[PDB]
Amino acid sequence: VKIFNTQDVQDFLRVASGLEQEGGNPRVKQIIHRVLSDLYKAIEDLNITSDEYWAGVAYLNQLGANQEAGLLSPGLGFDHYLDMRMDAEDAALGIENATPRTIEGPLYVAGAPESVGYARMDDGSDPNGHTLILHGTIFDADGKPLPNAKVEIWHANTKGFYSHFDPTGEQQAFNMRRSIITDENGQYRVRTILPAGYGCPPEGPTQQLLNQLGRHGNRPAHIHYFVSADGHRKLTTQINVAGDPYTYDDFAYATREGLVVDAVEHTDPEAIKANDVEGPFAEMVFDLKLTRLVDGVDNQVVDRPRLAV
Amino acid sequence: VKIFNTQDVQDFLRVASGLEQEGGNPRVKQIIHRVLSDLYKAIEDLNITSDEYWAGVAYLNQLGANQEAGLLSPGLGFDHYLDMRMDAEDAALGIENATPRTIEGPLYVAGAPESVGYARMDDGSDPNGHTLILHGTIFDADGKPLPNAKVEIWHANTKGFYSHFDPTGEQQAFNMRRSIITDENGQYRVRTILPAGYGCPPEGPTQQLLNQLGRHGNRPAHIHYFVSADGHRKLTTQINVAGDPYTYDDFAYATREGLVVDAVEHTDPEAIKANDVEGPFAEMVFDLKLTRLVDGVDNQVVDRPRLAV
Numbered sequence: 001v002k003i004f005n006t007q008d009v010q011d012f013l014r015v016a017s018g019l020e021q022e023g024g025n026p027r028v029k030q031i032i033h034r035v036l037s038d039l040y041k042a043i044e045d046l047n048i049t050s051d052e053y054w055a056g057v058a059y060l061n062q063l064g065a066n067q068e069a070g071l072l073s074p075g076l077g078f079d080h081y082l083d084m085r086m087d088a089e090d091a092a093l094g095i096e097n098a099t100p101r102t103i104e105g106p107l108y109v110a111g112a113p114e115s116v117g118y119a120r121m122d123d124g125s126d127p128n129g130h131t132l133i134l135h136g137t138i139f140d141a142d143g144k145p146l147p148n149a150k151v152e153i154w155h156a157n158t159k160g161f162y163s164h165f166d167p168t169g170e171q172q173a174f175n176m177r178r179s180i181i182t183d184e185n186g187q188y189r190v191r192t193i194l195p196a197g198y199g200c201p202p203e204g205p206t207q208q209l210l211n212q213l214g215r216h217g218n219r220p221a222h223i224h225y226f227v228s229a230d231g232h233r234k235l236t237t238q239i240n241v242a243g244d245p246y247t248y249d250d251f252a253y254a255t256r257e258g259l260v261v262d263a264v265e266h267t268d269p270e271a272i273k274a275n276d277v278e279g280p281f282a283e284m285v286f287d288l289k290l291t292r293l294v295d296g297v298d299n300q301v302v303d304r305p306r307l308a309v
Numbered sequence: 310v311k312i313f314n315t316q317d318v319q320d321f322l323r324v325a326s327g328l329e330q331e332g333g334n335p336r337v338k339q340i341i342h343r344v345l346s347d348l349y350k351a352i353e354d355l356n357i358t359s360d361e362y363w364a365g366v367a368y369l370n371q372l373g374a375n376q377e378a379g380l381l382s383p384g385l386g387f388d389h390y391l392d393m394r395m396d397a398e399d400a401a402l403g404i405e406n407a408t409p410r411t412i413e414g415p416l417y418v419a420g421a422p423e424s425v426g427y428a429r430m431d432d433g434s435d436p437n438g439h440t441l442i443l444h445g446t447i448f449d450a451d452g453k454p455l456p457n458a459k460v461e462i463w464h465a466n467t468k469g470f471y472s473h474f475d476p477t478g479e480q481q482a483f484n485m486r487r488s489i490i491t492d493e494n495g496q497y498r499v500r501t502i503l504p505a506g507y508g509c510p511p512e513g514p515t516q517q518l519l520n521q522l523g524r525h526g527n528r529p530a531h532i533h534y535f536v537s538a539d540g541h542r543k544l545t546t547q548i549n550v551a552g553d554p555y556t557y558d559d560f561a562y563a564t565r566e567g568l569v570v571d572a573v574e575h576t577d578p579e580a581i582k583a584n585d586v587e588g589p590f591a592e593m594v595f596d597l598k599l600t601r602l603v604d605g606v607d608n609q610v611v612d613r614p615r616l617a618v
């Protein structure tokens with residue numbers, strides 16, 4: 001029993017997609033027609049039953065009810081795939097990406113405190129927090145230190161929770177989220193704590209689907225970056241804390257060579273005083289290099305829904 | 310950009326689908342691998358940008374947040390498509406379906422009061438309700454009246470709202486929802502009111518998408534039926550009130566020839582007095598004929614999540 005390639009079904013697909021309708025958006029119709037065709041065909045090819053189908057529809061409802069579509073997305077590789085496409089396009093334009101891009105993730109929040117050159121990111125409310133001094137230089141497309149660049153950093157606490165998405169309700173707004181404008185030497189520097197790896201809500205729809213694929217929902221400890229500057233494209237990337245068990249087994253497939261960074265532990269009193277901290281701390285250095293706009297246009301910035309507080 | 314066909318993307322798709330993982334459900338992995346492959350390819354063929362992609366992800370959260378995946382499904386033709394498959398399968402088995410099946414819709418509620426041969430379905434709470442006497446006979450696969458068949462009926466009020474899903478504040482539980490056991494002559498008879506067509510929540514995600522396709526989100530006035538009996542398959546169908554503006558332009562594509570019924574209006578005192586009502590009323594007669602089990606089993610019953618009370 002096969003009906004997908006019969007006139008009845010093909011004509012019905014055009015009707016449902018609004019192809020012969022006068023109103024609407026032709027681009028949406030075009031995409032919907034393709035997606036529907038593909039799904040109708042997959043239902044036939046894989047002999048998906050009604051019981052299976054409705055289980056899929058129920059999952060969609062709970063996926064959205066839990067606001068997890070942006071979490072499942074990277075877990076199913078879309079986020080990284082979109083990055084592969086941008087990389088391919090840059091290669092086509094002859095653009096060399098000194099600092100590789102990687103996924104943004106769904107947890108960026110607009111509105112964080114802004115400062116010049118330095119900022120402390122945490123409020124010391126984490127018991128198990130280990131002091132981290134993260135600093136670096138931002139370079140322009142010509143390799144020269146870039147003053148006034150805006151470096152945005154966000155990461156999780158030791159429990160693997162992000163402010164604004166913390167279930168324990170423990171964190172104040174923008175905790176571990178800052179914008180640092182680079183100083184005269186093109187440098188940025190922050191005092192924060194070493195993040196812990198992130199895990200998907202174990203009871204949520206994203207993890208339940210991953211369980212069906214025999215997969216885990218963990219990410220290694222990492223730090224997110226947005227770096228923007230006049231005359232340059234906006235850089236989206238992240239660094240991984242070297243040594244993490246999941247560095248090369250991230251459920252979001254965000255790891256890339258060049259982004260794994262070593263956290264050097266400092267114990268002597270000399271270093272501690274020089275970075276005036278209260279005791280042993282970790283230090284990470286990470287420089288980032290920007291690319292220039294293409295004929296005055298940032299051909300790769302992404303406009304997507306982001307929480308703004 | 311064309312990278313879908315490279316080994317890097319093809320292997321990635323296998324990894325993301327857990328195909329190389331030992332745990333999990335092989336059936337789910339099989340379906341996920343196909344759906345991801347098709348979508349990754351659709352993104353390439355249609356050159357879907359990251360901006361477009363994330364609008365799609367946001368829409369998915371909104372769809373589930375409003376619990377409308379089961380409303381969008383029929384709007385995009387899936388529900389009707391699944392029935393087409395069922396019809397094709399029956400046609401191949403030589404099963405002549407006397408009463409045509411059509412979609413269940415997402416508003417069935419389990420546990421309605423039950424009675425033999427007759428019941429009034431509404432609580433008279435609808436100010437504009439017009440009395441409707443709906444009756445008919447249930448026939449077995451041989452064309453013989455079937456006593457003891459269970460006829461389940463549910464429908465909307467004059468505002469297009471159903472009990473348990475009324476946006477304006479609860480109706481009596483199970484208002485306009487009843488189960489009727491056919492009597493000694495295989496008949497069912499109910500007193501209720503004429504329903505008004507249903508329209509999708511105007512500001513909801515389903516209507517928002519339909520707008521982009523230049524389509525409306527309306528359904529003609531209709532009455533749902535579930536009919537079950539020993540030795541026969543469970544029938545899912547509905548009847549359309551003849552004359553409705555959307556009879557042949559249902560956004561859920563559920564109307565079928567043989568399911569459009571005329572509601573005859575009675576105003577003469579003799580009719581009124583005979584059916585013992587309090588004034589003019591409408592009458593609809595609709596008989597249903599059932600099909601026998603296939604090798605002792607109901608090959609088309611659908612088990613899907615349904616609200617129970």
Ligand SMILES: CCCCCCCCCCCCCCC(=O)OC[C@H](COP(=O)(O)OCC[N+](C)(C)C)OC(=O)CCCCCCCCC
Binds near residue numbers: 039048056059209
């Ligand atoms: C609005 C239009 C939307 C159209 C969408 C069409 C998608 C196609 C549908 C495919 C559905 C896959 C069917 C999976 C399935 O048949 O069962 C999936 C599991 C169930 O667990 P079981 O243990 O098997 O249950 C049974 C326990 N018993 C045996 C004891 C009874 O549950 C799950 O959530 C996995 C399902 C998630 C699949 C979502 C894919 C989409 C993501 C982009």
Ligand SMILES: CCCCCCCCCCCCCCC(=O)OC[C@H](COP(=O)(O)OCC[N+](C)(C)C)OC(=O)CCCCCCCCC
Binds near residue numbers: 031035073364521
């Ligand atoms: C987690 C894995 C899931 C992967 C899913 C991938 C989806 C495939 C890609 C989807 C591409 C959709 C592109 C839609 C688009 O580019 O714009 C869609 C419209 C927007 O209207 P505009 O007027 O342009 O808005 C702007 C008005 N301004 C200019 C004034 C600001 O909005 C909408 O909600 C329409 C959205 C339709 C998408 C639904 C898909 C579901 C199919 C089952």
Ligand SMILES: Cc1ccc(O)c(O)c1
Binds near residue numbers: 071104107198252
């Ligand atoms: C997809 C995703 C989930 C959690 C994170 O912390 C992150 O950076 C990305």
Ligand SMILES: Cc1ccc(O)c(O)c1
Binds near residue numbers: 413
């Ligand atoms: C999709 C849909 C919407 C409303 C209804 O009353 C119905 O039966 C089906």
Ligand SMILES: [Fe+3]
Binds near residue numbers: 105107
């Ligand atoms: Fe993160």
Ligand SMILES: [Fe+3]
Binds near residue numbers: 531
């Ligand atoms: Fe209905």
